[PDB]
Every structure is written in C-alpha cells, then in structure tokens.
Amino acid sequence: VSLKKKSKRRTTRLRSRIEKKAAESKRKQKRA
Amino acid sequence: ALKEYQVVGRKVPTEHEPVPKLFRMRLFAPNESVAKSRYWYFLKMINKVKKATGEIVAINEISEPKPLKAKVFGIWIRYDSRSGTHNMYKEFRDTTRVGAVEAMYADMAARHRARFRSIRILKVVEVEKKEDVRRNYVKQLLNPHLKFPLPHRRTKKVFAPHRPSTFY
Amino acid sequence: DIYKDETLTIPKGVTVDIKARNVTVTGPRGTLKQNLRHVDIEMKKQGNTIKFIVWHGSRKHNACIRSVYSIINNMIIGVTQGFRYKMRLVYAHFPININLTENGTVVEIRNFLGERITRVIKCLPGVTVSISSAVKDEIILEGNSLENVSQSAANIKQICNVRNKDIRKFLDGIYVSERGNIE
Amino acid sequence: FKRYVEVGRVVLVTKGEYTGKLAVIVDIVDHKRALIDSPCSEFPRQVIRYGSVVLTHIVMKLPRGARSGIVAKKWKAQDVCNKWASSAWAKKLEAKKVRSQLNDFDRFAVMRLKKQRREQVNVAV
Amino acid sequence: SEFQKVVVIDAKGHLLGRLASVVAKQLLGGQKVVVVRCEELNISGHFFRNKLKYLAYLRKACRYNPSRGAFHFRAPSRIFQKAVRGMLPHKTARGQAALEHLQAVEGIPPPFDKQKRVVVPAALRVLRLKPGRKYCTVGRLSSEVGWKYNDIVAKLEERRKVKSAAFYQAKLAKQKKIASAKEASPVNQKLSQFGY
Amino acid sequence: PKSRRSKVLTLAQTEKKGHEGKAALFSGVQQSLDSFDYMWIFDVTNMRNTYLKRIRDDWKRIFMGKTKVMAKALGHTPEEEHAENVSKLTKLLHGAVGLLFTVIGYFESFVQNDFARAGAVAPFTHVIPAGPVYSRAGQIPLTHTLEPQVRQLGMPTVLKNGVVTLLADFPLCTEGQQLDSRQTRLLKLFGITAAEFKVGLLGYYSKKGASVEFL
RNA sequence: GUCAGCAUCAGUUUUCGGGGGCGGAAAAAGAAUAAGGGAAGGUGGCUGUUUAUAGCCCUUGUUGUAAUACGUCCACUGGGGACUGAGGACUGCGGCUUGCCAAGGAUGCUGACAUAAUGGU
RNA sequence: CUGCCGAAGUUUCCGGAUAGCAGAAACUCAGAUCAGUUUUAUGAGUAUGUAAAAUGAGAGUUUCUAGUGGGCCAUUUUUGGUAAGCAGAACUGGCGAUGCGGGAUGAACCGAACGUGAGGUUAAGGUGCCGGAAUGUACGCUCAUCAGACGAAAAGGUGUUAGUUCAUCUAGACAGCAGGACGGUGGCCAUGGAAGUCGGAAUCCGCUAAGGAGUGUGUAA
RNA sequence: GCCAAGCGCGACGUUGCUUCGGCUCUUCCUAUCAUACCGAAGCAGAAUUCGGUAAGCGU
RNA sequence: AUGUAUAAAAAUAGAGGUAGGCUACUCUCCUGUAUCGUAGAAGAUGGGCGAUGGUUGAUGAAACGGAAGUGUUUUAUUGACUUGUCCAUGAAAUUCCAUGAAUCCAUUGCAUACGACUUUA
C-alpha cells in the first residue's frame, strides 16, 4: 500500500500547528 | 517566449545634471513591460537611479542576426540560493541567444529550483572557437563525426491491434 | 557522455553469437550459453572485434559495460583454456576423507573434526572434481565456467567451516590454493 | 542499428505543418534539436526537434552545414528524390495519401474494381 | 477512436495501473472488456519493493472475525481486478454494472484463444518506462505471495502457443497463395491509380 | 556524497619537487654536458643503489634524471642542442644513461653480479628441493627461524612443526622463459644472481673532435 | 390544438477561414550574384595545410522598394453551431430612392399528428 | 404568509446618560458642500502636522425612537523575555447578521458575496481513473528492501547531477605492471632485546633519478 | 579557562575539582531473559562476556 | 444489434521472412487511415455473354478442440443465390425531417437446548 510506518498526510490540527511552528521560527529569528 | 530587448534610459534632466548619462542594457523578458521593469531594477541596484527620477529613452527588440547558424553561448549569472549569493557559468549549444537563455532559465529552475526574479543574467557571450569550450557534453557535440541513435523515442486511437515496433 | 564503448578481440573461438543478448560462445573445449538481458547494452559484432556500446548512459549503467566485458572475456577464456582450481585439504588430527561420485560432480566429505556427519556437496554444472596424485590431500576442480568453478570452491569451503572453536588455534578446513587455467 | 542521427541523413517530418515532407539533417544542434533543410521552396531551412521527425534509412554524402543551394545541388546529384520512392515505405505512404483524397464515386469504382479482382479466387488444387 | 462490443486485451507487457485506468474508463463507457494473460502484467518498481507492498496489503486484518477484514486475493487476475475496482464507483449501481462487464483471467482460455487480442499503447511497458528501470511481473509476484497455479498456467500456455503457431503457419501458407494469385489478376495494375 | 576512490596520505614529508626537480635534473644534465670530457652515457641498470654508489665512487658523477628529458631539454634540432649532430643522437639516447668523470676496461670486462629481475630470461632451470627448503640451494656448511616466509612465499609449503615443508618439487625457473613475477620474487630471496650489468661506450662528445661514434 | 423541419431577419454568443493596410534593423534571415577577409569540427589532396576533385565562417555590393514571421488595423470579407423572439395601429433615428429597407424586440413557407404528441400527476 | 429598510457589535462621563451606528417627522439647501482617497504648497521632525488642485457623490442640519455596549481569529510594530513555550499592548483586518465554487472532509485557507430562469464566459482549483476537463507540448532532476505528491538539524552516505576554486599533465596525466627505495648508521639513550617501525630525545647526513635517523606489517631483535 | 575548521562568537579537542497498588485476564510493541543462528575478544577446551538478526515460542 | 467481420509468437540496444549452407543473402517493418467484405422494390422479375468459382440453407458423415474444450475443419449430396461482364422490365401520391423424488407423521442414537445430524421403514 504505502510501506510507511506513519500516515504521510497529517491531521488538520497537525498542519495548523505547523503554521504555528512556522510562526515560532519567525519569532525566534525576528524578535526572540 | 523570451525576447531580447535593448533598453536605454537615463534620469530626467535637471540643473545639476543637464546631460545625464544614458545607460543601455541587453536583457531578456517576455514583453517590453517586463523588460523595462527589469531594466529599472538593475539600474537602481547599480547606479542608485530612482525610477521616478529616470525615464526610458529607447526600447528595441533585437533579433538573432544568424538564427540559422548553430552556436555555443556562455552565460554568467548571479544565482540566488538558500544563501542567496552564488555565481555560475553555463554553456548551451543552439542557434539563438534567446533559446540559450530560455534553456538557461529552464535548466536553473530544474536543477537548482531558482525563479526568474532570483536569477539575474550578468552577461551572455558567443563562444565561437571550439577550444574555449569548457563543457565536456558541449565538446562531444563539436566532434566532427557526431552520430548517435535517437534516444527517448517512445514512438486517440486506443486499442491498437498489433504491438508497437519501437525500433527501426 | 553520449558515447561510451569497450572493444574486445575474439580468439579462435568458433561462435560468439549474441542473439537476444544471449552469448552462445562455442569453442574448441566446449560451449557455454549465458544471458545478458540484465544490461541494456548494444553488442555489435564485426569480424574479430566485439563492441559493447552505451549511448547517453549514466554512471550506474556505464559501470555495466566493463562488467559485461569481463564476464564475456572470462567465459571466452573458459571455452578456450578453461579454469582449474587447486584446493588443498588442511587437517591437524582427523584425516578428511573425500569421495568422488559420477566423475566428481558430487563430493562427499567425512571425518572432518571427527564428526560423523557426511557433508555432501553437488558441484555446479560443467564442473568436474578430481584428486591429483601429484600432491597429497589435493582436490582439482576443472571446468569451463569460472562462475561455476569458483562457486563450487566457495561452497566446499563454506561447508567445511569451523564453528564455536578458536580459529586462531583450530586450523582445520579446506582452502583454495591456486586459481589458474588448464593450459 | 540502421538509423544514426548524422549529418546528411534524410528524415521524414511527422509533426507540424510540414508533416510528410522530406528533409536532410544539415547540422546537429544538440541531443534534442537539429537543423534541417529541403530542396523544396515550400520547405524552409529550419531547426526542428528529433521528436517531430523519423530517421529514414537513406543517407546522402553532404558536407557539414551546407547552405540551401549546395544542399539542393547535392540532393539532385544523389537523386534522393525517387530514391525514397524506390522503397515500399514511400509507396505505401503515397498509396495511403491517394486513397484519402478519394471521393465517393471513386470509392464506388474501387469496390467494383476489387470485387472484379476477387472474383477469380482461382488457385490450383 | 472506435469501440467493439467485446474487447480482448493481451495484458502481456502492459502496466497494471495504466491498463487498469484505461479499462475502467472503457467499462464506464458501456463496453465489455476481457483481459487475458493477467499473470504477464508488469509493475514499475523492482520485485522486492512490490513484494513488500503486497505484504503490507496482507497485513490489514481485524481482531473480530478476519472474515470481516479485507479479503486479499493472490491471483494475478484478481490483483488486476482490484486495481480496476478502485478506479470505479463500485459502491454505486453504475460502478457495479461497470464491474460486471470486466472479465480478467490468467492465460487465454479456449473461448478467447481463437479471438483477436488488441493491446493498449497507453499502458505498454516499453513505451512508458525508461530502459533500465526495475519492474516486476504480477505472475511472479502472485506465485510468491500464495498463488499456486503458476506452473499449470505456464504449461497450458505453452500448448496454446504451439497450437496458435500451427494455425498461423496454415494461415500464412494460405495468405501466400492469395498473395501469389493477387498479381495474377490484371485489374490490380490496370487501375491501381486509386491507391489500392 | 560521490562514488570515488579515497587517496591515502603519509607523514614521511619526503615529497620531491616534481617539476622543479625535473628542472634541476635538466640543469645538472647541462652541467654534465658542460663538464670537461668523457661524455659518458651510463647511469645504472637493474643493479641496486649500493652498486650504483660503488660504480660512481670511482669517479671524481653518474646522473640520469628522466630518460629523454635531457634530450628534450637540449633539443632534437642541432641549433637548440649544445652538441653537434644531435638530431640522430637523440633517438639513440634512451634509458638511464648519463655523463661521468673519473674505466673503459673496467666497463668492458668488470661486470659485478647482482640479483636478477623480471622481463629477462634465466640461464638455466633451477629447481627447489622437496621437503625442508634451503636458502642457498644446499650450500650452507638453512635456518629454521624463517617462519613468516611460509606465508610470504605463496608456494605449496606446509608449515609442519614450525618448519616450512614443500609437498612437491617445483622448479624456480626454466631456461628460455622470461622470469615472471613469482619467479623473480622467489629468486630475490635465493642466491640466483643471473645478471651482469653492462655499459654503453658507443661514442664520445669531444669538444674538438665532435664525433659521437655509433658502433 | 400539439409537435416538428427549413428559410429570411433581430439579439447574445462561440468556432473556422480568406483578402488587404501599417509598423520593426522600413523584421532578422535567406536565395541569387560580384569583391575582400578568415579559417576550421581540415575536404580533395600531402599528422600537418587554406578550395583544389567537398565546402564553411566574416564584411561589403547587388538582386530590392525581396519575401516571410510577429505586432497592429480594416466603418474588408466568406462559412459552421447554439440560445433567445420581450413588445403589439401609427409616430423616432437612419438607408435606398411616393414608395422600399436587416432602420424604436419574428416572420414566412410547409409538414406530420391527434384512434398521440405535448403538458401534467 | 409575503415584501421593504436594516444595525451595534463601544467610545466618553457617573447600572443610568451622552455620543456613535438605523430610521422617521419637519425644515434649507444645488453660483453647495462633503469624502475611511490621492496630489500641490508651507513649515517642522522616508514619515509627520497645516493649507490649497484631482476624482467621486446633491450636500446639510434640527427635533425623537428603537436596538447595540461582547468576544474569537490573523497581520504588523513594539515591550520583555524562556532550555522551549509565550506573556503585554497598539494596529486595522476576517468571522460574526452570509449562502455559494475550490481546498478529499473542516469556525477561521484560496475565490466569491445570493430574487426566479435561458445562454455565454471566467475566479480559485484543476484535466490518469474515481471526476466535468490534454495518459497535452517543451526542457531538466529523482529510484527510496519505510520515494514523493504537505521540529528531531548539527550532521553522516565508495548515492546521483550540475557548477565554483585550486592543482598536476608528451619534461608522459593518473592507474597498473618492472624495479630502486642506498652509505655513514645498529645516529644518541633505554632493556633479556627494539638493527626505521619495545620505547625516550635527535631528526643529521654523502650519493644521486630518489630513498625517512622511516609509511605500516613483521622480527625475541 | 586554553586552544579553536571557520563564520565578536567559535565546533570537535584540552585544563580545572566536583486516594495508590496489585490479582486475574486479553491481546499487542521490541527497547530480547531464555530458545535458533551469526560477529568480536588471550576465545585452548568447557563455562562466559559483549555486540548483531530475531517477538516464532516461552518467561 | 445495424458488417454485433478479423486468433502466430517473441523482441524492443530488434524481429519477421524469401532465397540459401547453427553461419553466409538480400528484402520487409516505421501500427488497423490495414485486410476481409460492401451495387440489387432489407434488396424485386426475366434474358444473354464468361466463368466452373463464391456464398450459404437442409441432410449424411468422419478427423479435431478439455483451461471455461460448445467450437474448428475436411467433406458426400440436396435446395437456393451469385454483381464476374452486359441487357431488358418493375419502384412512385410515403409528391420536404420523424421510426421420479424430498419432507412431515414414525424409527434409530454413531447426534441432540430447540432445529439440525446419522439410521430404519
């Protein structure tokens, strides 16, 4: 089928927090 | 479809500079509007000439003088990457300067995933002597006895009756 | 590179036909048929020269040209001189008894390390096993295919393996001594 | 092999407005493009891609990068016209071409013609 | 281009998904498709990769009556039918009627060994895969995951090829006689102007 | 990264000048040509460095550089070459040869024996005695401590009771056949000095005579 | 009454062509034909050379007001398809010549079918 | 039952008033005034505030009478930071009163804002099949025994592909074969001993084409 | 702290002393105690130690 | 359904032949836009000329097909048709699209909550 051990496609909550992770990276670079 | 455009421009005349210097660039763009925009970008980044203070005095497309003569073109470019600072030199064999630039843009976006705005062409030259060629694949093209079987042939009318020949 | 080629000069060998990439090399000693379908290479035959040609091939595929060249040269050597492997028995205490059946295609090994299990190995086709009287405890494997002869030697050596013992002190085993041609 | 992309080889155009026209490879531009020329005036010298043409078995002795006049002179001297027609491949293409511009009355005459052709079915026992 | 009421497709040398995608659309178009030699189908990717793909598929099972779990079919025709079935709206009555118009078999049984077998150029491996790309055969993949009739199909196919060759020689010999007698009739050259 | 063979490195710090070394050899060759006389053409043969030093000891200097490097530096054309008629002498000039100043009789007659090498042919067919091996072909009036030689030889020598034993006889070489790799290596550890270093006294580049004989 | 087919128009629209202006390096080329220059991925000849028993590149002249492509325009033109027909004497703006008209929104010519088609439920 | 208009979503003062947003009634106003807008000019510090052309729209007030006074999400600036989260403002946005196309599915993403219909054409997203629409055209890259289609980070890989720089190269490039790889010297200490390669300090030398006080194996040495 | 490839930091190195809690049960994971097979070690043999494949089977 | 028309195999960095002695020949490929079949009041009525074939209907067969052989031939007849090449009649106003067993009731106990199961009759 896929041979992977995890679903490559994540959940909508998981991708939503990734944009939050991208927000954190902007916080680390710009201000933090 | 890219086009080579000669763009000549200068800042608006003023009392301090009644005879402003006219700067010319040979730059490629799909249309005149893009070419004049790219010209202004390069002029600002080099001479610090503001777009409002300047004006475009001449725009002219340049056709290939010898579109039926196969040539080799060497292009120096300022590649923009993750670090955003890289210089590259590439050589393409074709019959038109526009075609070589089009192949250059396709190659860079393919190998290095560089966009049109990140790439800036520094200079395009025609390497007429075989010896100055630096690329092995190009040199193999300039060999006198170049001959090779056709690669990547591959060939609605679904449901063909017989099997494809896929050969000579 | 557009063009990468290797050239081979064929010997008195009778036929080196490469029909369907299958090399049916027939020589004075014998005939070997092998398959070259695993590689996408052009085998162009002209007189006494054979060319293996690859057009616009990558480094991974270009590596196959020499490998195809070597196996062709090796099998040609087999049909002309052939391959003979001399394996010398090595024992300290228990004599190793070797028996040859149907002209040696099966080798039976007994009394290894005093073990009572008879180790029976059947050699690959085209390999005959003989015991040379010139040197004691000496086994000669002569055949046409270098693949078959060397594999037979590898199988015999691996069968007579020392387990759970200090190899530093236990020297028992059978090992290949020389690898050469019949002439 | 029997077809090699080399200077002077005759090709048949398969894609584009020049489909079915004969040309000769005057130069090798690169792995994917070549410059061709044809003696016919309606066919201009142009750079085409190999995917648009099929390599024919005919090869003419032509110097690298010959101009249109020299190519035409070499073409006439080596009579590549009617040299391609000598092959059964060209006859089939022309026979296919003749058939497609046939009209209804010609098609009616053909069926009578080939049925008169078939009425024999006389083979020695 | 044009349809046939029943179409026999020689699956040898084809690609699983590419042939399945073409077949599924043809079934929805109201055509009846018979696929022969499903054990000779090819799949892009080396055997071990494709074998692992099948093993992962076999792994799907329930803790309550594995009979309620997915039924894993090992026959090459059943593997092809699974590929076609996933490309059809099979939960829908239209897709169900599409499936009943498909008949995928291993080898070429008698009712079809005497019928013409067309091929699909959009799915042929030689026209779709770059040379030097690893691929596997469904017959080998099936026989290694549980299919137990590879040899019987192989033996039966060899006999059919012998009988088919004998039929061809008779047909070829017949065609030569008509070919020889063809130019005997003068009309073929009298009015060959029409391209015939 | 990329499939390439690794290159080993060493800390001996004995790297030669390379191109500068070749230039130094060319300069020394020119100085040797500019030397007073004798115009010798001889540096060494298969003899070792000790023999070359002994030959050069009776000389107040054998210099080879690179073969044909001195000829290339001098120039095939007589105008470029310092000597005369060097156009034909350049082809003759080959191998490790060079000027020396100190001989002719010793070169003609005195030829010290030395260990042989591959490519040449043996003058006889030496044999290896069976059983225990002998270092001097049974001329000792053979130590058994050469245990590592059993593994370092590769011949069918079984190490029984800490002594190398030959299962069957095997001649070291045969007359009329070129010495192979194994034969030369085996002869190196043995006393087979089937070699006689020679000298080349074809011509002499005299300042006045300028007659390089080719006899 | 129902439903059809076609034609000639109006409105909206889509899809193929043809012809002709103008523009740019007043395209670039190219071809043919005269100068000169250079050479090669070096042909005949003899690895090396300079059109010969192949030719190519560069410049200029010429054939020239060459063609063509591309851009743009035509109050230039020929077809194919689809949807729509609101309004209800006459006014108006126009065109051709009292009249006629494609000009302030569809008419004409036929069919078939009512023992059914259409519209329903 | 249908139709029309249609918010606020919160200041400012002590739960109430004022105001704001929405209407009504009654007035005056079109050589007039307005504006979630941009220029010009003045100064002052690319922005700022003040004044005076462009574009758009008919522009004004008075009374009096409803409803509203939340929140959530996101951008930017900034204030601190902390293993790392984040915390504090401001800012205008989006939701909120709002269906619809797409994103497989969705409060916050991309499009788009709604009477009933016919036709045409698009946005966003798409054109292998499910699925309407190119198994299009052209140029490349990629093979994963846990590909790809969407922090764990410093790096590792004899994985592939382009380049950048520096090196040698007919005085013969690497690679491979045939060799040399020497003499003082077993340089000096050390110990069963270590003669380049138990070890510790030196690291000199003549000859060359080149050979170290030795690259490792080895040797009791 | 000393270095410190490099880009004032500065990696590897180096110095400095110092309520919860458990019976049965069901399966499942391997990050494996045993059983099977290999690799290494002064592993003579025997008994081991360490490291791999491995959750079939027990615990 | 509207011709419900078409059976080699394998390769694709090669095949297939013809003509030859696994090797010397040359030719073909480059898809089916092919080949077979196709005139006739859904296909009427006769007459020639020239084949001496083709297409079948009904019998009689013998050989073949087992993978799902349900079809392949070879035929011996008989009945038709023949457009292979020519002729002569007829056609319409449909005067412009529509098409013998098992079961229950009994019996057994090798079985059983009840059905079922195994027996016997």
Query: Is the minimum distance from the CB of F16 to strand H below 7 Å?
Result: yes
CB contact under 8 A, C136 and F156: no
Method in brief: cryo-EM
Other chains touching B, judged by 3 or more CB pairs under 8 Å: C, D, E
Alpha carbon distance C30, C81 (integer Å): 10
Question: Domain check: are E132 and E35 in the same one?
Answer: yes
Question: Domain check: are F76 and F135 in the same one?
Answer: no
Question: Domain check: are E134 and E163 in the same one?
Answer: no
| Residue F46 CA, nucleotide H178 C1', distance (Å) | 10
Interface of C with E (CB under 8 A): 40, 61
CB contact under 8 A, D31 and C42: no
With touching defined as 3 or more inter-chain CB pairs under 8 Å, the answer for chains F and B is no
Query: Is the minimum distance from the CB of E171 to strand J below 7 Å?
Result: yes
CB contact under 8 A, B166 and E118: no
Question: Domain check: are E12 and E56 in the same one?
Answer: yes
Which among C171, C101, C176 is positioned nearest to C138, based on CA atoms? C176
Resolution in A: 2.8
**Strand order through the sheet with C3-9:** C3-9, C49-55, C42-46
Which of F89, F109, F129 finishes a domain? F109
Residue A1's closest chain E neighbor by CA?
E53
CB contact under 8 A, C2 and D31: yes
Chain B positions in Cβ-Cβ contact with residue C1 (cut-off 8 Å)? 136-137, 140
Tally of structural domains, chain E:
2
CB contact under 8 A, C134 and F3: no
Question: Domain check: are F50 and F96 in the same one?
Answer: yes
Question: Domain check: are F105 and F33 in the same one?
Answer: yes
Sequence length of chain D is 125
Domain housing F164: 120-189
Question: Domain check: are F124 and F173 in the same one?
Answer: yes
| Residue E184 CA, nucleotide J47 C1', distance (Å) | 32
Question: Domain check: are F84 and F151 in the same one?
Answer: no
Question: Domain check: are F103 and F138 in the same one?
Answer: no
CB C44 within 8 A of CB C50: yes
Domain housing E97: 1-150
Other chains touching F, judged by 3 or more CB pairs under 8 Å: C
Chain D positions in Cβ-Cβ contact with residue C56 (cut-off 8 Å)? 31
CB contact under 8 A, D1 and C2: no
Chain E positions in Cβ-Cβ contact with residue C40 (cut-off 8 Å)? 131-132
Chain B positions in Cβ-Cβ contact with residue D46 (cut-off 8 Å)? 68
3-class DSSP assignment, residue E90: coil
Half-sphere exposure (Cβ direction) of D41: Cα atoms closer than 13 Å: 0
Which of F109, F143, F159 finishes a domain? F109
Question: Which CATH number is F169's domain given?
Answer: 3.90.105.20
In Å, how far are C76, D7, E115, F157 from E11, measured between CA atoms?
Answer: 39, 41, 15, 64
- Hunting for tokens 């520094």 — which residue is that? B122
Tally of structural domains, chain F:
2
| Residue C177 CA, nucleotide J33 C1', distance (Å) | 71
Residue F100 in any domain: the answer is: yes
Residue nearest to nucleotide J10 (CA to C1'): C20
- Hunting for tokens 């013409």 — which residue is that? E116
Question: Domain check: are E46 and E104 in the same one?
Answer: yes
Question: Domain check: are E120 and E162 in the same one?
Answer: no
Question: Which CATH number is F37's domain given?
Answer: 3.30.70.1730
Partner E contacted by A2 (CB < 8 A): yes
Which among E34, E174, E2 is positioned nearest to E112, based on CA atoms? E34
Q: What is the 3-state secondary structure (H, E, C) of chain B?
A: CCEEEEEEEEECCCCCCCCCCCEEEEEEECCHHHHHHHHHHHHHHHHCCCCCCEEEEEEEECCCCCCCCCEEEEEEEEECCCCCCEEEEEEEEECCHHHHHHHHHHHHHHHCCCCCCCCCEEEEEECCCCCCCCCHHHHHHCCCCCCECCCCCCCCCCCECCCCCCCC
- Six-digit token pair at C6? 């290797």
Alpha carbon distance B39, B32 (integer Å): 10
Question: Domain check: are E131 and E181 in the same one?
Answer: no
Partner E contacted by A6 (CB < 8 A): no
**Could you say which nucleotides of strand J lie within 7 A of any protein CB atom?**
1, 4-15, 22-23, 27-39, 52-54, 65-72, 83-85
Alpha carbon distance C142, C180 (integer Å): 10
Residue F89 in any domain: the answer is: yes
Alpha carbon distance B89, B94 (integer Å): 16
| Residue D45 CA, nucleotide G29 C1', distance (Å) | 10
Question: Domain check: are E120 and E81 in the same one?
Answer: yes
Question: Domain check: are E123 and E178 in the same one?
Answer: no
Question: Domain check: are E155 and E142 in the same one?
Answer: no
Our CA-based measurement puts residue E127 at a distance from the nearest CA of chain D, in whole angstroms, of: 14
Which residues make beta-bridge pairs with F163?
F160
Partner B contacted by E126 (CB < 8 A): yes
Residue F31 in any domain: the answer is: yes
Give DSSP secondary structure letters for chain F: -----------------THHHHHHHHHHHHHHHHSSS--------SS-HHHHHHHHHT-------STTHHHHHH-SSTTTSSSSSHHHHHHH--SS-------HHHHHH---B----TTSB-SS-----SEE--TTSS-----S--THHHHHH-SSEEEETTEEEESS---S--TTSB--HHHHHHHHHTT----B-----S----TTT------
Alpha carbon distance E105, E38 (integer Å): 6
CB B134 within 8 A of CB D39: no
